[PDB]
Write a protein that binds this ligand. Structure first.
Ligand SMILES: [Zn+2]
Ligand SMILES: [Zn+2]
Ligand SMILES: [Zn+2]
Ligand SMILES: [Zn+2]
Ligand SMILES: [Zn+2]
Ligand SMILES: [Zn+2]
Ligand SMILES: [Zn+2]
Ligand SMILES: [Zn+2]
Ligand SMILES: [Zn+2]
Ligand SMILES: [Zn+2]
Ligand SMILES: [Zn+2]
Ligand SMILES: [Zn+2]
Ligand SMILES: [Zn+2]
Ligand SMILES: [Zn+2]
Ligand SMILES: [Zn+2]
Ligand SMILES: [Zn+2]
Ligand SMILES: [Zn+2]
Ligand SMILES: [Zn+2]
Lengths: 323, 323, 323, 323, 323, 323
């Protein structure tokens, strides 16, 4: 046929596809979320997240070292509390779980980039991402607490404070608190664009949030693309060091549009539900796990994400699939 | 706190979120892919696609009518051949399965928008999307065949010829053939941007493609965002009536960028692997199926897709979840 | 003929046009403006707005419930005052008509999204949208009053305070007042871009504004497209939750340009004159009312409006034309 | 208050608003559509278009001269046929009504810019905009006829051939025919973007189209903004001298987007329904006719239209409202 | 100090800089240019390119295998001729050096991506990049020869024909010739934007071009950024598979602008002069070679290049600096 | 051949290339960096920068006058300290080397545009660009010092204070200090985008910085293009009069992108390593020095730089190569 343009010419062999591959994926793009449960002896399996375990705080220095050894550059800590209360106050206690996870990680592996998930859903009685009032989850009371938590987390060693409560002004609030507390160097990995997604099922079982109801009054509507960009831009305006889109998998268009709207780094969260959809389909033999994971992750990088939070990170590292 | 901007104000209640919801999803956005197997009496279950059946050609007029009755506007037909050969020649026989699926659908429900998947992977001995030569899958020999198939499919009643073989110049080739054959009114739903994705596992079991190897020499690299846009733009240049991104789920950034690069309609394919990841995780209780499906689909619409090919379409229609 | 591109292929049938229809319209896009007259027993017909009635305040809880029952998500309240004065002070009385409309609506149907029109034209002796001085309608004195009104309206239950006085700094003024008064959660639906349009005739008879003269010193010039965009952007800068273009019908280009200039929601007002032009032509048999309304409204949505204020809303809801 | 930005400063008086008025409107922007009925003695009133008359062909030279005298620069001729047939063949007869309207106008007022509406809806038995086949309104057979009509219209004196049949490739077809026929200098005022609008009611009664059914298979969907732009761009590609959006009133966003997408002139049609909505509301006293017309027209110019087809043109000219 | 924004926070340690590093460099980005001299026994050292040798054709299969073994994906072949003539006709002889380099490389390592430099400067008596006439270097006579050379090179095994003669229409000419000759699958790596740079000194000594004078009548002006982009876009229009900017080092702005103007792959040539500037400064101890090379190369990738032609490639591969 | 477009037509002769040359280079684009060592009698040769000498402070008025006489418009002063300490306090002493270089230059040649390099690497014991603490190079303590230095430098006659320490908020800090000190007219030539480049080797030997380690915690990653643009934009936001990209040679894409992102002037630094790479290759005879320098410099101007800091400046001026 008379076709001057033939894109298939650069797909002829593996070598050519590698020369022309536009996106790369490596361990430098991954952040390992880790679940730490205090006051427990044995690792707990998160059934809805095949292969994922809750780390007993007592095995934490061992795990972090294992994580570090695999080449993992950073982790996002998530705690399973045995000290919840109406406001998740343990989150801001100098020696609450939040601080200890951070402190243990950083003392054990000082070059480990520790990100502290900053919220209250895992420490509150009601399971909401903040202070519960009769109007719902009070924005401003939560901000104060986030700020307090940030200072203790930073004091404990966290390199990034990562607010995931979806509260308005949370980056500003936490930045002021860190600065005032003397932690001007502590970064903020904002969960800038966080949707009220149905892809968080598994997480609830993993992290222990007691929430009976939803977070639609704070987490934004999955359908809102313009709002999603504005959400993250407000965060850049409030000084966040890195922004983030969560979930990432079904939101690659948001990741791409945000990438074209800011020079800030952009993180992308491959949520528990994404991880579970892959594991369960792979377990059923419907798909090849390794291929789907890499494509999934590569897709997130293609969309423009500088960092990806993935529960597969350690396994990819250990199996040497990524380096 | 002093926050003049509070995005949470429009997330306060369900009514407010509905007023402000930026994206809509309805039956007008869905296309039902259907699998028809010739020469069989009973429906066959596609194990890797829980809930999906191969329709015996003899039950086809009944199914299509059922599909139509649910409010489904259109279907994409896929055949399971009992007459394969080195070139998938049944695909171009006036009365091959391709034609019959189309003819049966259109005679039974004349207002049904019939899209014919136009390829050879389901009719060839080797399972490749075309004519197999010593150089691999010959582009040009395939184009001629696609063209022949398009004419018989169109002659049979197909409203859209949908080339999914990933061959270069396929839209041009098929358009010339339809025009010359007198089917100037027959549209082309190009699978313009089709990646060599690992999300097609289930499909192979559903549609019967005999391929032992891969399609990387024709289907494009999942990592290639610039090439992906160029792929579809070449298709617009060749006259396609509608373009398409496939898979869709992990390619929403591509869908969004393409949407900003063309005024043509854009279809998006929620592949078998996507459908399987949701079904299997839902079966394991890790996620809520209905919520994940709607979010998944709504996300594809948010990204900019005018149409979505989803295996969930009939179920959403029948259960009245979408109208 | 040799035409590779044939847009008519996707216009062939109703099914195809529905699959390809780029814009949707539903009850989630409509806001019902409602006219409430205090101290009256019977509904009053607004002659210049066939089918539109002034609701006696005493029938208000009944109407709102009717409105809610039809599926209407929100209303914009407009009062007809029997207590006007040089400054429209009833507008800011804790129990003035403004507050009562809001309170009645919200107590009767708590999930009803109440927007309070915030102005003084309906409460002043002179009929102007504010405080009348020798220089004309004093901007700053009006701002103070708007702020006072906003607090009582919010205190009364309004979800949105909607300033329609066209005063400079009105969003800022009202936001400060709400915040200081403790109504940080109360939104602002700014009538950001409001022209000095000739399409408001009917309104004057509906709402009772006593104005003898014009509002050209505050409402902006219909011809000013650049100013129109700047008007709304200043409003976004002052914190408005939603912006608005009014009128909408003859200003769809403004709606479209604003949509490309902000991520904020955008409301569009199908003014009384638009509603009257359609009703009267339809009454004369020159056009089909239902078709013209839907096209009119669909056009406003096509232009980019997230919400439309339309006097047809209830009728479309009740007749089940939109859902 | 402390407001550095005060847009109201330039709205203070009429002089200031005139200095700052961003859009102008004059007789140089208007095209008068004219309705000419052959074989009739008296002017016929178009009831659905108060003030609009069908001109008997015998009074045509008088009217055109009147039109010219008022300062009107150009007219769009529309005929009411007493010689219809299955194909509207009178439209292409050397001396059919189409030619005569043009010839009479140009001989009587040689500097008059004559635009010939080029279609068949007014000359066919069935009332469709073209050749009726079993598939509907055949595109290609219509194109041939349009071309024939264009040559006779051009031969007769028309300066612009204005295809309003909404057929694909109509500009290309008509350009080839004019060129081949030796009318390379004859322009094409394409009705590039013409929607299947409900605002054409009155027209049917004015122009006499016998259509019982709709034109949705050729006129495009009112909701389709992307398609609308593509429609006009294809026309620019086919060589149109001027493009057009019709209707104009509820499509100002389309006018604006097209203006930013082409350097070609853009015409905008204030359809019969628009004209009727204004007349009827004005007749009912709901609005001020003159103000609404000028705002309506000024809005169309604001949106970016270089020319407007308005039935008010002569009246505005004669009353000296525009010059 | 009160600084909310602190970019230094993500530069704190090596781990953080690696997480945030925006650009990657690997062996998949490199193409090794190789110099092959026919009819010689020993490797010849190119004095102006420390570490670079001319490979005797007889050691070629050994070198290519060595190159392949190091992980190098592709090479650009350059010949040193012992059969020059007024037109460089050996370049098009079925068994000229050009063909043999290609054939030897591909037979020895079939998966090696062979790019053939396509020009005549190394085969002509006068040393110019083409056919020398009294007007200078005849464009069109050169095009014919390039085409002939391309066919023999492709016939010999080259995967890419890489025209570096800077002739107008060279991509078009070579594409037609390959297609006509039946090498439709053979790609074209155009040296689309090639400046008349002073950075090619060393090359002349390496490749043996006999030119006494300059190439300013064909190679474009180093100062011309607009022309440089147009040069490459014309090449995309003529069908090139990949474009290229050469030199690359002092032209990163061109690389970046081209990257934003095309979806095609972009190669970038780190010319001999660049390689020599680094080697000589490193030899003098003024800079660290390895760091400068990687920064140099990383910079080219940062600018947007998909591939880089670098003489350091093999050394980086062998020393395991890149993988 | 049939080629309508022939770019070679404007490359035919030197006259045509000069008419069409898109970029110019002159002495008005150059800034001469100068190295002044206090307390020394003889000029010292910087071995890693052939031709570059350290000027003894006592010969400074002679050199500056020589520099001025050659037509050089401005210089960037760099001192070699014989009074270093833990904080580089001499830099802020009223009569420290920094002040004296400036004072000597401006008194000797009052119209000379003096830019003072503002940092501490040349005055600190440890060689870092600031105050060394246990956390590394303290940002804020450095800012205070920079500010102090700026005032004494400005007081001494510097026209531009040029912070090259890569500290966050350095422009803001220095602007406040100058303003408060009464030097509101003193400009700031920020080294806005300064990478942690390996091209600074030679400089260390020239300027005497004692640093044993690296500056990666303050100078930004060479690979970071988005951060690089943000770095400079923050500087514009802090009030810098001119921005700068350093190094320039391997960062022309950054220069170009910044040029399209700001209206501020942009300086570009051709670092010592660039100067050394050219000198050493030229010394080895691998390239022509004069041609490479001019191309190098012209390339920097092509990329969009308004000013270039080049060590070749005086030589080009004196040899009359540029005027
Ligand atoms: Zn305990
Ligand atoms: Zn939470
Ligand atoms: Zn937020
Ligand atoms: Zn059979
Ligand atoms: Zn296939
Ligand atoms: Zn393709
Ligand atoms: Zn009363
Ligand atoms: Zn008012
Ligand atoms: Zn305003
Ligand atoms: Zn007759
Ligand atoms: Zn018609
Ligand atoms: Zn058209
Ligand atoms: Zn020989
Ligand atoms: Zn050459
Ligand atoms: Zn060229
Ligand atoms: Zn001393
Ligand atoms: Zn320094
Ligand atoms: Zn900086």
């Amino acid at each position: 046929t008379d076709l001057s343009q033939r894109p298939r010419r650069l797909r002829k062999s593996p070598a050519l596809r590698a020369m022309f591959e536009e996106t790369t994926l490596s361990l430098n793009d991954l952040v390992l979320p880790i679940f730490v449960e205090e006051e427990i002896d044995d690792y707990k399996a998160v059934e809805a997240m095949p292969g994922v375990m809750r780390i007993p705080e007592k095995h934490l220095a061992r795990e972090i070292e294992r994580i570090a050894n695999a080449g993992i550059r950073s982790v996002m800590t998530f705690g399973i509390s045995h000290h919840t209360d109406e406001t998740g106050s343990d989150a801001w206690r100098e020696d609450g779980l939040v601080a200890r996870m951070s402190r243990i990680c950083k003392q054990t592996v000082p070059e480990m980039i520790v990100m502290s998930d900053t919220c209250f859903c895992e420490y509150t009685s009601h399971g909401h991402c903040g202070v519960l009032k009769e109007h719902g989850v009070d924005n401003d009371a939560t901000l104060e607490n986030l700020g307090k938590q940030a200072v203790v987390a930073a004091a404990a060693g966290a390199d990034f404070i990562a607010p995931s409560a979806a509260m308005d002004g949370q980056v500003q609030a936490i930045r002021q608190a860190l600065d005032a507390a003397g932690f001007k160097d502590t970064a903020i990995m904002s969960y800038s664009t966080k949707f009220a997604s149905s892809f968080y099922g598994p997480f609830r079982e993993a992290a222990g949030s007691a929430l009976k109801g939803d977070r639609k009054s704070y987490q934004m509507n999955p359908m809102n693309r313009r709002e999603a960009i504005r959400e993250s831009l407000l965060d850049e305006a409030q000084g966040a060091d890195c922004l983030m889109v969560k979930p990432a998998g079904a939101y690659l268009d948001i990741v791409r549009e945000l990438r074209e709207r800011t020079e800030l780094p952009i993180g992308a969260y491959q949520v528990s539900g994404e991880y579970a959809m892959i594991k369960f389909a792979a377990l059923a033999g419907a798909i090849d796990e390794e291929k789907v994971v890499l494509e999934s992750l590569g897709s997130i990088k293609r969309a423009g994400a500088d960092l990806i939070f993935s529960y597969f990170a350690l396994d990819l590292a250990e199996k040497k699939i990524l380096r």
